[PDB]
Ligand binder design. Structure first.
Ligand code: HEM
Length: 154
């Protein structure tokens, strides 16, 4: 809800390792999301036809969308909570057009933490994880509040 400066530094330090391979991370993240919560796949008319993990990894458009996710997320994270203006378009499209429940944001948050562990086994320790979890939570809580402001959910 409020991150210390240290936690924000941890988040941005970790995020710089995402930005080193945005496509790899975004692809993995979407794949983990889709494998651990298949219900989220059917939200994607572009991808709902992808079943095996090998198929999803061969989907360039899935990779492209991973980039879109993470670049949008990274722009938000870099604001260190001052992401009001960056969230509204995301909240708007995910509440009203995509109809994404906040719970689905929790699933992708888990998929982010998981993927960061499997791509950075020595770089993503307990502190960095706590910091990243708090950042994604704040993100999810603020998105929740922006849903409510658009008159949606919860
Ligand atoms: C960190 C969390 C997330 C971020 C930053 C994010 C970001 C974005 C962005 C930038 C777009 C493109 C512009 C737009 O449509 O608003 C998009 C589209 C979309 N998002 Fe998300 N998203 C997140 C979580 C999710 C989750 C968890 C789901 C569903 C389970 C989802 C479903 C969709 C869908 C269906 C689209 C349209 C896809 C398409 O047009 O092919 N999003 N998202």
């Amino acid at each position: 809800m409020v991150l210390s400066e240290g936690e924000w530094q941890l988040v941005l330090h970790v995020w710089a390792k995402v930005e080193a391979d945005v496509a790899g991370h975004g692809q993995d993240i979407l794949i983990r999301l889709f494998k651990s919560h298949p219900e989220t796949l059917e939200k994607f008319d572009r991808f709902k036809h992808l079943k095996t993990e090998a198929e999803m990894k061969a989907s360039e458009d899935l990779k492209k969308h991973g980039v879109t996710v993470l670049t949008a997320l990274g722009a938000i994270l870099k604001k260190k909570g001052h992401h009001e203006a960056e969230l509204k378009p995301l909240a708007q499209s995910h509440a009203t057009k995509h109809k994404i429940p906040i719970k689905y944001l929790e699933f992708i948050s888990e998929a982010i933490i998981h993927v960061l562990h499997s791509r950075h086994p020595g770089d993503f320790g307990a502190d960095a994880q706590g910091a990243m979890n708090k950042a994604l939570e704040l993100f999810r809580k603020d998105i929740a509040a922006k849903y409510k402001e658009l008159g949606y959910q919860g």
